Design a protein around this nucleic acid. Structure first.
Ligand SMILES: [Mg+2]
Ligand SMILES: [Mg+2]
Ligand SMILES: [Mg+2]
Ligand SMILES: [Mg+2]
Ligand SMILES: [Mg+2]
Ligand SMILES: [Mg+2]
Ligand SMILES: [Mg+2]
Ligand SMILES: [Mg+2]
Ligand SMILES: [Mg+2]
Ligand SMILES: [Mg+2]
Ligand SMILES: [Mg+2]
Ligand SMILES: [Mg+2]
Ligand SMILES: [Mg+2]
Ligand SMILES: [Mg+2]
Ligand SMILES: [Mg+2]
Ligand SMILES: [Mg+2]
Ligand SMILES: [Mg+2]
Ligand SMILES: [Mg+2]
Ligand SMILES: [Mg+2]
Ligand SMILES: [Mg+2]
Ligand SMILES: [Mg+2]
Ligand SMILES: [Mg+2]
Ligand SMILES: [Mg+2]
Ligand SMILES: [Mg+2]
Ligand SMILES: [Mg+2]
Lengths: 128, 52, 147, 187, 104
RNA sequence: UGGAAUGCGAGUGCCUAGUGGGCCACUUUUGGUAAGCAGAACUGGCGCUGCGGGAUGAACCGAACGCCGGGUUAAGGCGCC
RNA sequence: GCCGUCGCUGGCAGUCGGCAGAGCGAGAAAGAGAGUGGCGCGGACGCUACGCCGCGACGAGUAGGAGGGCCGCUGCGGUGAGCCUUGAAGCCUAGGGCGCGGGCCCGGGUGGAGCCGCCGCAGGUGCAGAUCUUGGUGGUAGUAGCAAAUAUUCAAACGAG
C-alpha cells in the first residue's frame, strides 16, 4: 500500500558480492576496503585464475537502473521540511531519507509533510 | 645533472643561508613607527616646515 | 596549492614515480654544474657552446654610467612630441619645422631604422647614425648636435 | 584480438576554451550554434579559435591590419581577428577600417574611431555577417615570440642559429670554446 | 663482472614505431654547396632581370594577341537504358509524367 | 585518361618520465670436448601477460583479456581419474 | 545484452501554437521563395547547452605519463533562516541499502556537547611492510626453572592461618 514509482523496471546487477581486498582475510590490519594491488609478483594483480577479483569499469551498472533502490525510487537525504519540498515535482522517481542526526521531534513534521505531498520516506518509523 | 636544453645556473646557496634570512613581517610596523615619528617631529618643530 | 600536484596522485604507488630499478638516489652525476668537461660534456657542448675558455680584454672598475647611450629609431621619432605638433607643422605654410629634442625624451643617439613622414623637422641629439642623418635630411630636416 | 595500435586513438585538440570567462563562453555558445547550423566554414574557423590558448591567439598590430586590408579587392570588408588589436606607433596615417576583435587596446580604439572606422564585437559580427560574408579573417604572427628563437637544432650543432639560454649576455658568457676556431673549434 | 657487449636486437622494432620517415621534399631546394663561381653569376642574372622587363611585356601581349587571334578563328540493353532514363530525377521528369497521365 | 596493385587521413612543434643488468626459441653463426657455457645476425617472444593445451613448468603449441547469455572452434584430446 | 573509452572536431537554441499549422534521411548542388503582366480555445517530455541525444569501432599491462573523482582527512572565506540535550562527535552492530571502486547513506545500541552539506581557499592530507618509532597483547607456557658449599627432627606457645 506504499507509494509506487512511475515505472519499476528490472534491476540487473553484474555483481552483488563486495570486492574484498587482497589478503584482508589473513590479517586484521588489512581492512576489506578495496586497494589496487601493485606488487611485482602479485598474483591477484596479474589476474590468475581462481584468485580474488579486481573491480573494473566493466562491472558498471546500467545507467537506467543505477542508484535505483529496490523499491524503484532514488533516495535524497533531507534535513528539514524545507529541503523536503524540492521533491514535490519528482515524487514518482525520488524518495526522501531523513538524516540520522534529525531529532525525533523534527522527524514527525517531516514524516507528516511527506505524507501530504505523496513523497515516499525510506525511514518513516525511526526514532518514534 | 643537466637535462636537455636549459640555463646553466649558479645559485649562491652554498653557505648557511638559512641562518641569515631577513624576513619582512615587521614592515607594516616599521611604516607605522616611522609615520608616528614624522608626525611627532612635525608637532615639535611647528610651525617650521616638517620636511626640514 | 599542494592538492593539485602529483604527490597526491602518487599515494599507494610504490617508488613515488622514480622507478624500481634506478630508484631516486641522492646525487648521481654530481652536484650542480659538475662534469662539464667530463661525463656531462655532451650536454654542455650541445646546448652551451662557448661555455669554457676566455675571450677578450678585462676591464677593471667598469662603470656602466659612462657608456650610457639610449638609442631611438627614426620610426618612433615623432612619438617623442605631441600629436598636435606634427599635424600643425604638416599643415603650416610658413615652412617652420618643429624641434624634436631626443635628450629631453631620454635618448642620446638617433638610429636610422624606419622611414620618416614627408615633413621637415629639426632633430637634436648627442649622436646620430649616418643613415639616420641622411633620412632626416631626405625630408628637409636638420641634425643638431648637443652635449 | 584485432591487430591495431591505440596510441593515436585520442586526438589532442581543444573542444572548448580552457578559459572560464563567461563572456568568452557566451560567444562560444553563439558560434557553436552558427558553426553547426550553417554551411559556412568561416563560422567553424572562428569557433575553433575561440578555444585556442593565449599563445595561439597572437595580437594583431594596427600596422599589419592596415597592410593586409589594403591589398586589392578588400575594400569595404570587415577585418576579423580572434584576439587583441594592438596599436602601432610606427604608423602615421590610419585609414577608415571596419574591424571585429575580442579586444582592442585603448589607444588603438581612439585611432580607429577617429579615422571614421567601426569596431565590432563578435556578437555584433554574427548579426551583421551570420555566415561571415564580406570578411577578411586575420591572424597575428604566431612565431612572434621570444621562445621560438630557442627552438630547433641545439645551438652547439653545425649551422644551428638557435638562441642559447644564458643568464647574462656579454663577452664572458658562452663565447669562448665552440664559438670560435681560436678556442678549440667552431661549427 | 662481465656484461653484454653490443646488440641491435629490438632496434628495428623501435625504429618503426614512429616509422622510418623519408626526408621531406620541397619543390625549391637550397643553393647551399653549389659552385661559388656559378652562384655568383646566377645572382648577377637575377640582379638584372628587370632590365628586360619592358621587352617581356611587349612579347607577352603580342604572343597573347596571336594566341587569342588563332583561337577566335578556330572557334547494356535498350530496355535497361530506357528505364535508367525514366528513373533519372531530372531527365525522366517528363517521362514519369507521361506514365502518370496515362495511368489516369 | 592525377598515368601500376592494394590499403590508409596526414603534416608539424614544444615539454617530457622511466630505461640504459636483460633473458629465451626457429634459422644463420664465433670460441669451446661440451655445458641449463661464453659471444653475434634476423624475427618473434618472456620481462610487462593473464587464458585453453603440453600432468607439473617465465619462453613450447593455440590464443592475447571490459562484465555476461547462447552458438562454434584452435592447439589438444575422448578406458577411469 | 550492459559498462566505459575513442571517433563521427556527429544532432538539439525549432518549446518558431488560434499574431498556430507541425517537413528538411534523402541515391545523384541550389527555394516546402516573393509578388508583376500575358460548434470547441486544446495540443506529453525536453534545454543543470559544463546539458541532453544518436551512430560506429574498440577495451592486456610492469617502469612511467595523463585525466576524472557527488573518493576520504584537517583548517579558512562564503552559503545552507543547515543539524543538535526531544541528544553532537566518537564507538559497536548475524539490521536495510547505494556505488565498478575510493566510500557513503539509513535503522538499532552506547555516548554526553558539539557537528556537517554545497561554492571556493589551504595543507604537517590517505600505510602492510622500512631488522620503521612509541605503547599494548599473544603462542611458546603453567613450560625452562626455583639442584654450588653434609641436615634436620619432636613437643608447646602466639595466631584465622
Ligand atoms: Mg615479475
Ligand atoms: Mg631526467
Ligand atoms: Mg603503475
Ligand atoms: Mg625503491
Ligand atoms: Mg617521474
Ligand atoms: Mg638511474
Ligand atoms: Mg642499473
Ligand atoms: Mg634528486
Ligand atoms: Mg578486444
Ligand atoms: Mg594499450
Ligand atoms: Mg598516446
Ligand atoms: Mg649493458
Ligand atoms: Mg647465450
Ligand atoms: Mg625489471
Ligand atoms: Mg609488449
Ligand atoms: Mg603471453
Ligand atoms: Mg610433459
Ligand atoms: Mg561461451
Ligand atoms: Mg587498459
Ligand atoms: Mg562483526
Ligand atoms: Mg561535561
Ligand atoms: Mg595542519
Ligand atoms: Mg601500521
Ligand atoms: Mg617443571
Ligand atoms: Mg640454589
Amino acid at each position: 500500500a506504499a507509494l509506487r514509482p512511475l515505472v519499476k523496471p528490472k534491476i540487473v546487477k553484474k555483481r552483488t558480492k563486495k570486492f574484498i581486498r587482497h589478503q584482508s582475510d589473513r590479517y586484521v590490519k588489512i581492512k576489506r576496503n578495496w586497494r589496487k594491488p601493485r606488487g611485482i609478483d602479485n598474483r591477484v594483480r596479474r589476474r590468475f585464475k581462481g584468485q580474488i577479483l579486481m573491480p573494473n569499469i566493466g562491472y558498471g551498472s546500467n545507467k537506467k537502473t543505477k542508484h535505483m533502490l529496490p523499491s524503484g525510487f532514488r533516495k535524497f537525504l533531507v534535513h528539514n521540511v524545507k529541503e523536503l519540498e524540492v521533491l514535490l515535482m519528482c515524487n514518482k522517481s525520488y524518495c526522501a531519507e531523513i538524516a540520522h542526526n534529525v531529532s525525533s521531534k523534527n522527524r514527525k513534521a517531516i514524516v507528516e509533510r511527506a505524507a501530504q505531498l505523496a513523497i515516499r520516506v525510506t525511514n518513516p518509523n525511526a526514532r518514534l | 645533472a643537466p637535462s636537455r636544453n636549459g640555463m646553466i645556473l649558479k645559485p649562491h646557496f652554498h653557505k648557511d643561508w638559512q641562518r641569515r634570512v631577513a624576513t619582512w613581517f615587521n614592515q607594516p610596523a616599521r611604516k607605522i613607527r616611522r609615520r608616528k615619528a614624522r608626525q611627532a617631529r612635525a608637532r615639535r618643530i611647528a610651525p617650521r616646515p616638517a620636511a626640514g | 596549492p599542494s592538492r593539485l600536484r602529483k604527490t597526491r596522485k602518487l599515494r599507494g604507488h610504490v617508488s613515488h614515480g622514480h622507478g624500481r630499478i634506478g630508484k631516486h638516489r641522492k646525487h648521481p652525476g654530481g652536484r650542480g654544474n659538475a662534469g662539464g668537461m667530463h661525463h656531462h660534456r655532451i650536454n654542455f657542448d650541445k646546448y652551451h657552446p662557448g661555455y669554457f675558455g676566455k675571450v677578450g680584454m678585462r676591464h677593471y672598475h667598469l662603470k656602466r654610467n659612462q657608456s650610457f647611450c639610449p638609442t631611438v629609431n627614426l620610426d618612433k621619432l615623432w612619438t617623442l612630441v605631441s600629436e598636435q605638433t606634427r599635424v600643425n607643422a604638416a599643415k603650416n605654410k610658413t615652412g617652420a619645422a618643429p624641434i624634436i629634442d631626443v635628450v629631453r625624451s631620454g635618448y642620446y643617439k638617433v638610429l636610422g631604422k624606419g622611414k620618416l613622414p614627408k615633413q621637415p623637422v629639426i632633430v637634436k641629439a648627442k649622436f646620430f647614425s649616418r643613415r639616420a642623418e641622411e633620412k632626416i635630411k631626405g625630408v628637409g630636416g636638420a641634425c643638431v648636435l648637443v652635449a | 584480438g584485432v591487430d591495431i595500435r591505440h596510441n593515436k586513438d585520442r586526438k589532442v585538440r581543444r573542444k572548448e576554451p580552457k578559459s572560464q570567462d563567461i563572456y568568452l563562453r557566451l560567444l562560444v555558445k553563439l558560434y557553436r550554434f552558427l558553426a553547426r547550423r550553417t554551411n559556412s566554414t568561416f563560422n567553424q574557423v572562428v569557433l575553433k579559435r575561440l578555444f585556442m590558448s593565449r599563445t595561439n591567439r597572437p595580437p594583431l598590430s594596427l600596422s599589419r591590419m592596415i597592410r593586409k586590408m589594403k591589398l586589392p579587392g578588400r575594400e569595404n570588408k570587415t577585418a576579423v581577428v580572434v584576439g587583441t588589436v594592438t596599436d602601432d606607433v610606427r604608423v602615421q596615417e590610419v585609414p577608415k577600417l571596419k574591424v571585429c576583435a575580442l579586444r582592442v587596446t585603448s589607444r588603438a580604439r581612439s585611432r580607429i574611431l577617429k579615422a571614421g572606422g567601426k569596431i565590432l564585437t563578435f556578437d555584433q559580427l554574427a548579426l551583421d555577417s551570420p555566415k561571415g560574408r564580406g570578411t577578411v579573417l586575420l591572424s597575428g604572427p604566431r612565431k612572434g615570440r621570444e621562445v621560438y628563437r630557442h627552438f630547433g637544432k641545439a645551438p652547439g650543432t653545425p649551422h644551428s642559429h638557435t638562441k642559447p639560454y644564458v643568464r647574462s649576455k656579454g663577452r664572458k658568457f658562452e663565447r669562448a670554446r665552440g664559438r670560435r676556431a681560436s678556442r678549440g673549434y667552431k661549427n | 663482472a662481465k656484461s653484454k657487449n653490443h646488440t641491435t636486437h629490438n632496434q628495428s622494432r623501435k625504429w618503426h614505431r614512429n616509422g622510418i620517415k623519408k626526408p621531406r621534399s620541397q619543390r625549391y631546394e637550397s643553393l647551399k654547396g653549389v659552385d661559388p663561381k656559378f652562384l655568383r653569376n646566377m645572382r648577377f642574372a637575377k640582379k638584372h632581370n628587370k632590365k628586360g622587363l619592358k621587352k617581356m611585356q611587349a612579347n607577352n601581349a603580342k604572343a597573347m594577341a596571336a594566341r587569342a587571334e588563332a583561337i577566335k578563328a578556330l572557334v547494356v540493353s535498350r530496355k535497361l537504358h530506357r528505364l535508367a532514363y525514366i528513373a533519372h530525377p531530372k531527365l525522366g521528369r517528363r517521362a514519369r509524367a507521361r506514365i502518370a497521365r496515362g495511368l489516369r
